[PDB]
Design a protein around this ligand. Structure first.
Ligand SMILES: Nc1ncnc2c1ncn2[C@@H]1O[C@H](COP(=O)(O)OP(=O)(O)OP(=O)(O)O)[C@@H](O)[C@H]1O
Ligand SMILES: Nc1ncnc2c1ncn2[C@@H]1O[C@H](COP(=O)(O)OP(=O)(O)OP(=O)(O)O)[C@@H](O)[C@H]1O
Ligand SMILES: Nc1ncnc2c1ncn2[C@@H]1O[C@H](COP(=O)(O)OP(=O)(O)OP(=O)(O)O)[C@@H](O)[C@H]1O
Ligand SMILES: Nc1ncnc2c1ncn2[C@@H]1O[C@H](COP(=O)(O)OP(=O)(O)O)[C@@H](O)[C@H]1O
Ligand SMILES: Nc1ncnc2c1ncn2[C@@H]1O[C@H](COP(=O)(O)OP(=O)(O)O)[C@@H](O)[C@H]1O
Ligand SMILES: Nc1ncnc2c1ncn2[C@@H]1O[C@H](COP(=O)(O)OP(=O)(O)O)[C@@H](O)[C@H]1O
Lengths: 712, 372, 541
């Protein structure tokens, strides 16, 4: 019965917690007894027990100071245990908070603390805080040091030392990183994977002894820069509670020759002699890059020292090393094998829900206006990493300040209070910031998630069923395959007219199994062909393995499968584990020009023809695309479907875009004339007048002939 | 909004001289012209973090710190930085690229360490890392150990600087890509400012600023010179004025006796720069900014071209409406088209159409000729 | 920890026996070499894929021998201050010499004496010279044996592979089913395994896994079990319930999940492997079977007759014919009969070697083949290289081989005409052999072989299908059977969702074969037969 509800204490005591009489009986306590209360993360203190009949069963009263100390709010839960062993602090040093001693003169000790410590016997603990009201002001004090340690009672025998520098309030959080799981959003699976491998070996070390195994030590995280990898490591370390040590990359690579090894050795030994411990090596690639990059003696001796130290700890336990980098193929390969970063974790760009959570986390201190539609932002902002979202928020705030600059002057060192009281950011500022944003994650291949179902794909239902049979059954029901001993097919190939709905088809297939999706567009293939890209095919497949299950989509495969790239891709496909659910789906417009080597069994063998959408498919496409546009009531799209024979989905999208463009042109012209909230039928007629198929009949018949030949 | 900070000396006949109304530093905003937008951006990103730090506390945001100016050499990046620093009147620590690079091995990093430490000690501070490229070139350019120790030290100091301290870092580099790519991430030189060659009005302002002390003759038509000078950066204009004065003195040399150490006071006081001297200087001068791609403005309207009415309407619908009225585009949810491709017989005036399109949206114009 | 004796190693009888008979006798019984008056070899070079237990083998041998042991790591020796590595090496060597008998293990030797090309720096030259001087000066010293572990034999400097240096070479290949089973038993000697464990099934399923991969698999399975039982565990409690802690136990499904989340990498590069295919997985081709038996087995099993007659057994053979006829299976069976290892070099690997992006090289391949003699090297789809630098290297290596050594190069390709004629000359891949498509009885035998691991409806005769598959390659029948199984599993899943289908039915086979095709066009078969008859006329007096 140590879990009790939190309530706002009426009194003004920071070391008194009230409990219900029934609760007090259950806890077997007495009035005035001191008990230890632990809250969120690893924060805890001691409070004097008080009897409160008005308190309901399973409830307790704590003032705002206690809640701030425990990092909790109203209504939370805490763990309370008896604390009868608390002793008397023989000598305590306490210093005031700077902002609480702004111009306050006289002996602060006698004025404030002495009334507050006249036989008060208030329990104290390291790092605690307490506010004392003297005269017409209130001053806060912190438990700088206590003897005997840790938690004791400030009685008359205690000797109070109030000499020292003021405790500036800002540095408690500005210069220190206290971030928990609540500061991370949009990445839950990765957080669970990291926790199950970091906390379990440390918080519960006897489980592995019971089962007689040695849990993996190394852990290598990688992903696009700015995704919060450092923040995730910090949060995990803080939540675990074990001693944490950081080994920054450039910091260790920016010291005189022969001292970087000294720093690494000192860090490792210090972690060793404080078991359990967490060692985080940010920007590992800076100190241990690939061989082709570093050739000097120093940049190889550093790597050798790192390898020696890492291999020297596999015997000693209770220490785990967490790395961080942007690409798997950006560190010396010797670091990725048994005993050195066995586990690999991949972090990808978040989804809509993750973006919304990140926005909520960041916009909890800003003074947002009432008219904000964060959900709309999350919908609009695609491809934005957490760093990009933070930059967006900062830019929006800067725009708001710039707009408010008209009512303020650049002179003086102070601003009118009323002006500062009116700082409220609005949606226009966020839209402007989005306009001025510079996302960069998409410039290189990254892992993301998709949310497309069998909803936006009109027609070709037999192809849907074939994809279901190929993909869903192996993943969801591998037991049947094992019973029949059949290894599921690896990949599929799509061929047909361009713009017939292949990318979204692959996205839907990935969605069904609920797996991540990786895309490798044609330009990326060309860049890797010329060897002027920062990523390699091996890197793509390693990321896919790390984030398994995944669907790797190769768009415009014929641009390179007309060689080095094809050989690398084929080798990577062959060197693929059967059981891992890594499906490779390729798309092309010239199946003849594709190198036959790829089409062999065990590779992208299952060929699928993507036919031009039918009248019903065209109607479905038209309904889907206009799902977010005001249409004139009574519009009939069946006539358009009939008249749009031979038109691909892209063609229908072009027609719709042209019609909308004409409608908005008319609307803006009418507004300037000074109304037009609907897209009339005549707009669609205007678009049709200057629209035509982008697919030649010759290509259509050639595709039909090729499909017929393959069928024969 | 926009240039809102510019609206309203050097924190300072005898009284006028004392109040400022060889080493004449502290050049204020007056000593700069033709770059109003960029100067406004720099002032907005520098002053408010230091002059009025309580606004960010009131609203609850972390202001950006890294500011990276880049543009063709001679556009006056150093002048702008020094003017802003003097106007703000804060502890100003100046670091040059080559100056640090010229030190012995092992001493070009301790200088950076002490620089950043001192800047932190005496906040608020402004640090101007002039010619940052020399101390942080592209990764492939330098493979030596020292050339990476310096860069790593710079990165570590930059990352450690991000804190409550009211310190702002400003860096200048002609080539935006020359800087090590790792220096352009969040928490580092993220905000970027581009300096472009001035237009006719900018050239007029520069010429007036420089041509305030010279004994100009009455027959001077600075407007004509500004009109004729195209692609002249501020440094080129200063060189033009110097060359014109040199030509004037050379012409007057006939009555000057070089053998005598001193000269007749009447001859010294009779010096006067004539328009012909400026024309001769224009003939001699040779700008070099246009050799590389630069950002400049154009002032072509729909009157220097003929016909093409349907083409003009199509271009307007394509570009103007997205720029002038993005609200309706958002209302209909349709994103604007990205690019356009003109084709036809040569010599029809496609460049003029592009310039007119740029002018209508009041957007800067960048060009890439065939030889490029 | 130490005391890792021979009981901690399994599946490596041959290599352990070699290293033991090479190390123990010089140290355990030095008097033998005095009596017979020879100089036992000193240097030893073990090389193979990472994680195969090289260091574990060395430590086990040293501990069992009960001699003074000294361990040297390449990284740490290379991580010292400039001018310190030579001092450390001199110390180590002097200490080993003074405490004779002694053993020295230069782990990761390639990291301190790399290929000469990557030794631009001065310190690398200094360290390599110091190591060479120390080794050469050791000849006077006795009762000291040096063991080196390197990833591949082509990475260390060539100067280290002469007489008086690391001359004796040992190759560590991936283990076979028995070795994997032994490793699983060794590792799972403490885990609280549930009674429903089929370690033999795991060994059969897991192919190509190295010992390290198997250890990681066991750790992952245990982690999965802990995670599944975590539902009864709350992170809040510091004390763990005794009952919950004891209830933990791994099961077969945990091992299957771990296999699912596994990333083996040994097969990524060429490695010596063992195969156990007999004359059962291949049906028909009786004449070819007998011819290959005569060609290969007799020289190996009965060298006395060849010595009597002086014949030099043929080095390599070449197979040509329609693709998918089972050439690889035939080569593997040939290797099995002579009880010799097998090395496979697929076509993408050869292309990678052509483009010089692959770590391995032809010379490295043949060095491994020699070290693992007897062996069977298999070069697949030589057409992609014989359309040359690679061809020249291959010819040079093939010519530069010892006749006595039992190394046979077997080439496979569908374009015998396009192969460079230089390869068909005597003393090379000159023995061409035609591999026709399977016969009716061969088709039935293949169908039965592929169905030995699949339940079937009793009374399901396959003769009709065999007759209705004229001119269909083995891959075709494999595709047909896989499609039939796919339809069967589809129906089973449909019934289960609607809820049955415990074995295949003839209707499934009919449905699958309704959409079959011949993988080989008739024109290709005509061309192959014409080429075969042309070659026959070349040797058909
Ligand atoms: N869930 C989140 N995902 C991503 N960014 C987040 C998240 N929550 C907060 N952020 C913010 O995103 C930014 C991430 O910066 P940070 O340097 O920690 O990321 P990083 O990419 O892991 O770093 P680096 O690779 O440089 O060490 C910080 O502003 C952090 O506050
Ligand atoms: N508004 C102005 N724009 C450009 N140049 C100006 C302006 N006003 C004066 N100048 C003159 O232009 C030249 C600019 O010199 P400055 O050292 O600032 O150039 P820079 O190329 O930015 O320098 P750096 O060597 O630091 O890269 C000087 O002659 C200055 O007098
Ligand atoms: N019979 C075995 N063969 C191989 N590995 C085994 C065997 N039995 C157990 N193992 C385990 O396999 C792993 C082999 O790792 P080990 O360090 O010996 O490999 P290695 O590649 O030879 O080493 P290195 O290159 O670091 O010297 C260890 O976990 C060892 O405990
Ligand atoms: N099922 C569908 N079939 C065809 N086009 C579709 C379908 N659903 C939507 N579309 C529209 O047709 C366009 C065709 O282009 P897209 O499918 O993206 O390219 P590609 O077919 O080359 O992968 C889509 O972008 C989308 O606007
Ligand atoms: N309406 C016009 N039609 C054709 N040429 C024009 C027009 N207006 C100006 N010009 C002249 O065209 C020249 C540039 O032609 P332009 O087509 O822009 O470049 P290019 O000839 O390289 O295509 C200028 O010298 C200008 O005087
Ligand atoms: N007697 C046989 N004849 C033909 N194929 C067989 C025979 N026995 C088994 N197979 C099948 O042949 C396949 C191997 O094909 P293979 O000949 O290696 O292709 P390739 O001709 O491209 O080398 C195996 O999957 C196996 O199931």
């Amino acid at each position: 019965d140590n879990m009790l509800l939190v309530d706002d204490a009426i009194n003004d005591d920071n070391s008194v917690i009230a409990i219900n009489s029934n609760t007090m009986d259950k806890l077997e306590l007495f009035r005035g007894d001191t008990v230890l209360v632990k809250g969120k993360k690893r924060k805890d203190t001691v409070l004097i027990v008080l009897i409160d009949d008005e308190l309901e069963d399973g409830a307790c009263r704590i003032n705002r100071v206690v809640r701030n100390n425990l990092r909790i709010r109203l209504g939370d839960l805490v763990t309370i245990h008896p604390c009868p062993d608390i002793k008397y602090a023989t000598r305590i040093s306490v210093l005031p908070i700077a902002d609480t001693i702004e111009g306050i003169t006289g002996n602060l000790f006698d004025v404030f603390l002495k009334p507050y410590f006249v036989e008060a016997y208030r329990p104290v603990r390291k790092g605690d805080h307490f506010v004392v009201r003297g005269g017409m002001r209130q001053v806060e004090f912190k438990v700088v040091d206590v003897e005997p340690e840790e938690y004791a009672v400030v009685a008359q025998d205690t000797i109070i030392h109030w000499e020292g520098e003021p405790i500036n309030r800002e540095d408690e959080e500005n210069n220190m990183n206290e971030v928990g799981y609540d500061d991370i959003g949009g990445c839950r699976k990765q957080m669970a994977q990291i926790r199950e491998m970091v906390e379990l070996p440390l918080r519960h070390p006897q489980l592995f002894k019971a089962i007689g195994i040695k849990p993996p030590r190394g852990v290598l995280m990688y992903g696009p820069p700015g995704t919060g990898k450092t923040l995730m490591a910090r949060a995990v370390a803080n939540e675990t509670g074990a001693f944490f040590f950081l080994i920054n990359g450039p910091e260790v690579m920016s010291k005189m020759a022969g001292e970087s090894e000294s720093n690494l050795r000192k860090a490792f030994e210090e972690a060793e002699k404080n078991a359990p411990a967490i060692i985080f090596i940010d920007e590992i690639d800076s100190i241990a890059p690939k061989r082709d990059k570093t050739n000097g003696e120093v940049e190889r001796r550093v790597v050798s020292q790192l390898l020696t130290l890492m291999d020297g700890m596999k015997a000693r336990s209770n220490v785990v090393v967490i790395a961080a980098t942007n690409r798997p193929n950006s560190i010396d390969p010797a670091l990725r094998r048994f005993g050195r970063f066995d586990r690999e974790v991949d972090i990808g760009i978040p989804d809509a829900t993750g973006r919304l959570e990140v926005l909520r986390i960041h916009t909890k201190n800003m003074k947002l206006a009432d008219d904000v539609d964060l959900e709309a932002l999350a919908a609009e902002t695609h491809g934005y990493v957490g760093a990009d979202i933070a930059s967006l928020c900062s830019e929006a705030a800067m725009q708001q300040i710039r707009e408010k600059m008209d009512l303020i002057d650049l002179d003086e060192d102070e601003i009118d209070a009323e002006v500062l009281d009116s700082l409220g950011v609005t949606m226009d500022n966020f839209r402007f910031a989005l306009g001025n944003s510079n996302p960069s994650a998409l410039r290189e291949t990254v892992v993301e998630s998709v949310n497309v179902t069998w909803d936006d794909v009109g027609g070709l239902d037999e192809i849907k069923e074939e994809l279901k049979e190929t993909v869903e059954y192996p993943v969801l029901h591998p037991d049947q395959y094992t019973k029949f001993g059949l290894s599921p097919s690896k990949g599929v190939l799509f061929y047909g007219p361009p713009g017939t709905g292949k990318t979204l088809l692959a996205k839907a297939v990935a969605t069904e199994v609920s797996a991540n999706f990786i895309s490798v567009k044609g330009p990326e293939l060309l860049s890797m062909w010329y060897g002027e890209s920062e990523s390699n095919i091996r890197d793509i497949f390693d990321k896919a393995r790390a984030a398994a299950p995944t669907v790797v989509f190769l768009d415009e495969l014929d641009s390179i499968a007309k060689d080095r790239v094809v050989n690398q891709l084929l080798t990577e496909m062959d060197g693929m584990n059967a059981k891992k659910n890594v499906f490779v789906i390729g798309a092309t417009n010239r199946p003849d020009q594709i190198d036959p080597a790829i089409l062999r069994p065990g590779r992208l063998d299952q060929l699928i023809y993507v036919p031009l959408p039918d009248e019903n498919a065209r109607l479905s496409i038209l309904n889907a695309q206009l799902r977010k546009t005001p249409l004139e009531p009574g519009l009939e799209l069946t006539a358009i479907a009939k008249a749009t024979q031979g038109f691909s989905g892209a063609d229908l999208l072009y027609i719709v875009q042209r019609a909308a463009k004409y409608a908005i042109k008319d609307s803006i012209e009418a507004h300037r004339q000074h109304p037009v909230p609907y897209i009339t039928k005549e707009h669609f007629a205007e678009a049709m007048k200057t629209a035509k198929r982008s697919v030649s009949d010759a290509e259509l018949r050639r595709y039909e002939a090729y499909s017929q030949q393959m069928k024969a | 909004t926009a240039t809102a900070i510019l609206r309203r000396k050097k924190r300072k006949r005898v009284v006028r001289n004392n109040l400022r109304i060889n080493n004449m530093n502290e050049v204020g905003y007056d000593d700069i012209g033709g770059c109003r937008k960029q100067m406004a951006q720099i002032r907005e990103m520098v002053e408010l973090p230091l002059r009025h730090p309580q606004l960010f506390k009131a609203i609850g945001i972390k202001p950006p710190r890294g500011v990276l100016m880049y543009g063709p050499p001679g556009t006056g990046k150093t002048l702008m930085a020094r003017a802003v620093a003097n106007e703000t009147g804060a502890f100003f620590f100046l670091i040059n690229g080559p100056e640090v690079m010229s030190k012995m091995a092992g001493e070009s990093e301790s200088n950076l360490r002490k620089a950043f430490e001192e800047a932190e000690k005496n906040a608020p501070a402004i640090i101007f890392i002039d010619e940052i490229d020399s101390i942080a070139p592209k990764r492939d350019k330098t493979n030596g150990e020292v050339e990476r120790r310096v860069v790593s030290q710079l990165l570590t100091l930059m990352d450690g600087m991000k804190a409550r301290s009211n310190v702002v870092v400003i860096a200048a580099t002609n080539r935006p890509n020359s800087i090590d790519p790792a220096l352009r991430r969040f928490g580092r030189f993220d905000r970027e400012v581009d300096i472009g060659i001035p237009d006719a009005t900018g050239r007029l302002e520069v010429l007036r600023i420089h041509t305030k002390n010279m004994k100009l003759a009455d027959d001077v038509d600075l407007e004509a010179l500004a009109a004729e000078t195209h692609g002249y950066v501020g440094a080129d204009i200063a060189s033009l004025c110097s060359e014109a004065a040199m030509q004037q003195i050379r012409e007057k040399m006939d009555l000057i006796d070089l053998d005598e150490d001193e000269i007749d006071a009447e001859v010294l006081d009779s010096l006067g720069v004539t328009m012909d001297n400026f024309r001769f200087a224009l003939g001699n001068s040779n700008p070099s900014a246009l050799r590389e791609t630069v950002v400049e403005s154009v002032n072509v309207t729909w009157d220097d071209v003929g016909g093409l009415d349907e083409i003009k309407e199509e271009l307007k619908e394509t570009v103007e409406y997205p720029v002038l009225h993005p609200d309706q585009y958002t209302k209909f949810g349709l994103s604007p088209s990205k690019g356009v491709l003109f084709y036809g017989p040569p010599g029809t005036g496609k460049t003029l159409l592009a310039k007119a399109v740029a002018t209508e949206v009041s957007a800067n114009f960048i060009s890439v000729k065939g030889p490029e």
